[PDB]
Design a protein around this ligand. Structure first.
Ligand SMILES: *[C@@H]1O[C@H](CO)[C@@H](O)[C@H](O[C@@H]2O[C@H](CO)[C@@H](O[C@@H]3O[C@H](CO[C@H]4O[C@H](CO)[C@@H](O)[C@H](O)[C@@H]4O)[C@@H](O)[C@H](O[C@H]4O[C@H](CO)[C@@H](O)[C@H](O)[C@@H]4O)[C@@H]3O)[C@H](O)[C@H]2NC(C)=O)[C@H]1NC(C)=O
Ligand SMILES: *[C@@H]1O[C@H](CO)[C@@H](O[C@@H]2O[C@H](CO)[C@@H](O[C@@H]3O[C@H](CO[C@H]4O[C@H](CO)[C@@H](O)[C@H](O)[C@@H]4O)[C@@H](O)[C@H](O[C@H]4O[C@H](CO)[C@@H](O)[C@H](O)[C@@H]4O)[C@@H]3O)[C@H](O)[C@H]2NC(C)=O)[C@H](O)[C@H]1NC(C)=O
Ligand SMILES: *[C@@H]1O[C@H](CO)[C@@H](O[C@@H]2O[C@H](CO)[C@@H](O)[C@H](O[C@@H]3O[C@H](CO)[C@@H](O)[C@H](O)[C@@H]3O)[C@H]2NC(C)=O)[C@H](O)[C@H]1NC(C)=O
Ligand SMILES: *[C@@H]1O[C@H](CO)[C@@H](O[C@@H]2O[C@H](CO)[C@@H](O[C@@H]3O[C@H](CO)[C@@H](O)[C@H](O)[C@@H]3O)[C@H](O)[C@H]2NC(C)=O)[C@H](O)[C@H]1NC(C)=O
Ligand code: NAG
Ligand code: NAG
Ligand code: CA
Ligand code: CA
Ligand code: CA
Ligand code: CA
Ligand code: CA
Ligand code: CA
Ligand code: CA
Ligand code: CA
Lengths: 570, 570
């Protein structure tokens, strides 16, 4: 038995007498709370055991279930330099010294064959009389042989004359522009850029505002000021957006225009839409109004491109298998490519050269190019390809075009004529889109939604930029130097409806269905249509709000720290 | 023919002769530029057409291809009232005002089986003699026809006596409570809630700061202010987050603690991690430091729940097919349910009642309840279920439990004992998780990535809250009233290691792989481990920046307008 101050629970466990009937089941057999004193409340009041309340006793045995359990009824009524060597050896073009008896023995001994790069003989001959431009080398047998200083090599048709190597013959020599010199070279930066030299090597750097990355996410377009590593709101409350492209400040406003497609869902067709994007840090939650261009019968716009010098918008519909061109306001639709297309994935245009490029991801993947007016169609790659999701053009390096591939998991480039095919990125974890800017190749891993960065030449290591939802569909660099804004428009106001580009000059065209009248080739039978302008957007600087007056003209206020009509002055 | 000053294209098109040699291929043919004399540069300085530059003749024909073409080396040197009854009508059951002649003709004319009430024949009677309780009508040949006064129903035996209704029983009568009274009812808001009336009717507004939403994605966890509509950063850079739960403000320091499970990635085990959350508004100014509990052999913790009273954490694992418990610092792991489990998906705990609930979404789905100590396991719902991926408990409405399906995509509610199953929400677009707060019920449509909302009783209609991502795995409401903080811990420090809870009391238990000391039920032969303390948090408020010194303690770079060790003084 337990002590006087302890209570024997039924199982034998001794419980301190204080814990008995304290309101908690304190031992396994639950007998520390069994046989507790009844709940006395007061005279004249019936306590229902299920609540603990004390209802009047006049409510007992009246056939009304007054308490939750009704006890009133049922209960009561119940690296060193190149090593020198003696004259019995020779310093080859390669960084080594090889014995002179291995020279003019007619067997390669220092890799570059420099030991027998044109050995010469002659009874009248001496090495140091006149044989080649820079240096010759003599051996005691009477033979003699020449070599050329770095940056030079003996001529192929005459092994006694030094000729310069054009260092631009190699892909990865300089950023931007390689320029050849006799025995040397230079890597001067193009206008707008600046020279810089970083840990991995020389680097050409842009100017002005830092680049932005525009990221469509099937519901929103989100900005990323890459030098601040912060996001900004921009467009929202949209659905099934698939690809975007922009035109840089067409009206000299400080407000570029972003063109984005919308996929068709169910029985509602898709459309291409346009809206202003602030070139200014005003990434605040300012109102953004999109405008539909009104292009009908769109079922899957998969690729989109903007000709900023011709003021045309090019796109391709994978389901309908057409590549179409129209003005930026959606007028004068025109079918360019209508045959031999199974699934046109993405397109890009080069108005400087008048060439447009596109990819096919259907049964027989291929990459094709043609004139921007639809003529001179040709192929570029037809082997070792699958699902070429997208391509972009590096206008600053001989207009070489890179493209992505999510079946070979590769990124590789080619010149605009189809030559110089090189592999750039391997193991790119399903790249779905890409863009090239200032050497940095950006691409999107669709299976996991990361933005990845590497040098466009592919001679560095990968870097992860940021991670977003798998709704990410494309990466696009939003910067002034992305497109040469100063490219002159060759059109001479001769065409009536459309003035497409071709390599040099231009070419007139009619809207789809209408033809030229009597072979005029400038005048079409279709009636001309008025241009479509966009409503004035909010241009407020330094993070001001935006309102609409009684005239619904967007006028906007801000903090008085900055003043002006548009919050532009300090 | 063409004019004198107009050049002729060979197709019959006449164009101004100024376009000759202007630079662009104007004609449809190329003759507009073909035949143009090239620009003259200088004598003795050859202009290479491939670049547009002029080069001295000494550099020319040196076998160095100075220009890209290299031709310099080859060719250069070649109701108001609801129709109330008068004396001429009959009330029938509760207002069916047809003419009076339905009185006790022994025919069910009213349609409702209340046309004849009383109706005991005999001409010499009036119930004013106290034959029926209240509100008779005079029977023409039987004295009394006695329908019950409003708020009452007739008893089976002695139908002349009317039983009071129980209006608290009917589902969805008041948002929070009820008080059955004599022929009437009164309903009120429980402690912590303020009475308000919307355009529809009653609302019990929770006091204090407005509720938040916590959205865990595979990469990050995002806060949301249901009243301000602005997001917040919280935890970032993490990977493979599945489900979360929190413990409100344990130390009164002003910071709750958020627990979240991390899946197994590749061939590497997952973990359960915890971190502070600022109850006060803050973001990007306090770095968030997560810590690991240290639970090995963990693959897929789809279910996590925090018992705020006993200070235990309950989680399930789909791969191990078992449910385990441990302290909030990862000590003393113990298995609770180990048999007849296919895929334990979600879990919830009710310390006040002493019951914890889990859902199984295997080949034979079921929803079960058991004591926290692990006994009295039973099946609540097995009929008509498919993939019950979610689970929530409404601690206010008689501890009712809700769950979300994914095959039948309904949301249902049932009492904790398993009776009165109701289908609260239909066609819920495959909900994945639940959380019931105040008046409304929240759930996540997984594929669409949208957070939705409805009145928790199923009345009215749905409403989109916000859209995140296809990565959204849960929604959990964050507020101090979500878990009643004033529930007293029944444990009395007599148990070493785990002190589990049960209906009405506690129970001591030993960690896994160890037993009690023989002859004892409060002590085990295993050792004990010291509690694992939290690292000090960044408590900065109002935008103050946290900072780490040589001591690595968090301190504040407090913002303007506020003073104090962090920012606590206005
Ligand atoms: C992305 O993030 C990066 C890093 O955070 C940002 O740098 C970048 O844009 C930055 O945006 C701010 C605000 O618009 C710019 O501030 C302005 O800079 C002007 C020029 O500053 C000069 O000197 C700095 C020295 O470091 C040099 O870096 C700059 O390149 C430049 O040579 C500055 O003059 C200007 O104030 C003038 O204009 C006001 C207009 O009202 C007047 O009131 C005021 O009196 C004065 O005359 C302002 O401070 C910032 O320059 C810019 N980036 C940089 C550093 O150049 C972010 N981009 C986006 C899209 O957000
Ligand atoms: C989620 O969204 C809600 C609503 O926006 C936020 O709630 C706000 O929280 C801030 C910070 O706590 C509140 O700001 C402070 O309010 C105090 C008074 O509160 C009452 O009056 C305000 C008037 O604006 C009401 O909005 C509020 O609801 C109460 O009725 C002020 O006294 C504070 O300033 C004064 O005290 C400080 C003390 O240091 C001094 O320094 C100041 O000089 C001054 O004397 C301050 O203004 C704000 O009021 C809250 N608004 C509402 C509507 O709730 C949540 O903060 C947000 N997220 C969460 C949960 O953090
Ligand atoms: C973006 O495009 C512009 C053209 O809008 C490029 O500027 C012109 O580029 C051409 C071809 O490289 C140069 O010849 C131009 O320089 C001058 O050209 C005239 C003949 O028109 C010569 O007589 C001059 O000696 C001089 O060479 C150059 N300038 C213009 C406005 O015509 C520009 O290079 C390009 N920039 C980038 C960043 O791509
Ligand atoms: C959160 O839990 C606490 C309990 O931990 C709840 O407080 C409780 O409120 C009820 C009703 O006011 C109290 O019941 C009353 O008890 C007294 C005797 O103490 C009795 O005379 C009354 O007739 C009535 O039964 C209860 O004592 C009280 N508990 C404590 C310790 O304060 C609180 O309501 C809960 N909140 C929510 C929203 O669930
Ligand atoms: C070879 O050419 C170099 C210049 O690179 C010159 O300086 C050196 O003297 C030459 N060597 C001989 C052996 O002529
Ligand atoms: C009978 O019911 C009416 C309301 O319909 C009420 O006004 C009247 O007082 C009741 N009569 C009695 C006797 O209770
Ligand atoms: Ca007790
Ligand atoms: Ca009663
Ligand atoms: Ca040799
Ligand atoms: Ca050279
Ligand atoms: Ca011309
Ligand atoms: Ca030459
Ligand atoms: Ca009748
Ligand atoms: Ca009642």
């Amino acid at each position: 038995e337990c002590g006087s101050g302890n209570f024997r629970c039924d199982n034998g466990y001794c419980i301190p007498a204080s814990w008995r009937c304290d309101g908690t089941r304190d031992c396994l057999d639950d007998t520390d709370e069994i046989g507790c004193p009844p709940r006395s409340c007061e005279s004249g009041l019936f306590l229902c055991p299920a609540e603990g309340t004390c209802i009047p006793s006049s409510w007992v045995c009246d056939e009304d279930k007054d308490c939750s359990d009704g006890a009133d009824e049922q209960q009561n009524c119940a690296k060193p330099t190149h090593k020198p060597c003696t004259d019995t050896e020779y310093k080859c073009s390669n960084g080594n010294c090889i014995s002179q008896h291995y020279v003019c023995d007619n067997v390669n001994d220092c890799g570059d064959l420099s030991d027998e790069t044109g050995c010469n003989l002659g009874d009248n001959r001496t090495c140091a009389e006149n044989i080649c431009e820079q240096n010759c080398t003599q051996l005691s047998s009477g033979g003699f042989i020449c070599s050329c200083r770095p940056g030079f090599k003996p001529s192929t048709l005459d092994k006694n004359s030094c000729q310069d190597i054009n260092e631009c013959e190699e892909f990865g020599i300089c950023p931007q522009s390689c320029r050849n010199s006799k025995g040397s070279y230079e890597c001067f930066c193009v206008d707008g850029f600046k020279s810089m030299s970083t840990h991995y090597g020389e680097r050409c750097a842009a100017d002005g505002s830092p680049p932005l990355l525009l990221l469509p996410e099937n519901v929103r377009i989100r900005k990323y000021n890459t030098s601040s590593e912060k996001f900004s709101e921009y467009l929202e409350e949209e659905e099934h957006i698939q690809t975007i492209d922009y035109d840089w400040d067409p009206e000299h406003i400080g407000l570029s225009v972003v063109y984005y497609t919308v996929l068709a869902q169910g029985s509602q067709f898709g459309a291409i839409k346009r809206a202003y994007i602030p070139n200014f840090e005003s990434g605040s939650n300012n109102p953004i109004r999109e405008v539909d261009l009104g292009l009908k019968y769109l079922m899957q716009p998969d690729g989109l491109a903007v000709d900023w010098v011709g003021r045309h918008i090019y796109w391709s519909d994978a389901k309908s298998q057409r590549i179409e061109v129209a003005t930026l306001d959606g007028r004068y639709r025109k079918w360019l490519i209508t045959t031999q297309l199974d699934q046109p994935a993405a397109i890009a245009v080069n108005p400087k050269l008048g060439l447009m490029f596109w990819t096919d991801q259907g049964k027989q993947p291929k990459i094709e190019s043609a004139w921007m007016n639809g003529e001179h169609r040709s192929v570029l790659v037809s082997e070792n390809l699958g699902w070429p999701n997208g391509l972009s053009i590096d206008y600053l390096n001989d207009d070489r075009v890179y493209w992505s591939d999510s079946k070979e998991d590769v990124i590789e480039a080619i010149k605009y004529d189809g030559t110089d095919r090189r592999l750039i990125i391997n193991e790119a974890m399903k790249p779905f889109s890409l863009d090239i800017f200032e050497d940095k190749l950006y691409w999107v891993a669709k299976e996991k939604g990361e933005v990845w960065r590497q040098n466009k030449f592919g001679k560095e290591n990968k870097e992860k930029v940021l991670v977003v939802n798998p709704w990410l569909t494309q990466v696009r660099i939003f910067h002034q130097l992305r497109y040469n804004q100063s490219v002159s428009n060759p059109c001479k106001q001769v065409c009536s409806h459309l003035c497409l580009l071709r390599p040099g000059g231009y070419s007139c065209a009619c809207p789809q269905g209408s033809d030229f009248v009597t072979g005029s080739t400038v005048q079409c039978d279709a009636a001309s249509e008025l241009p479509v302008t966009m409503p004035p957007p909010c241009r407020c600087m330094h993070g001001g709000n935006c309102y609409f007056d009684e005239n619904e003209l967007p006028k906007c206020k801000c903090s008085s720290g900055y003043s002006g009509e548009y919050c532009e002055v300090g």
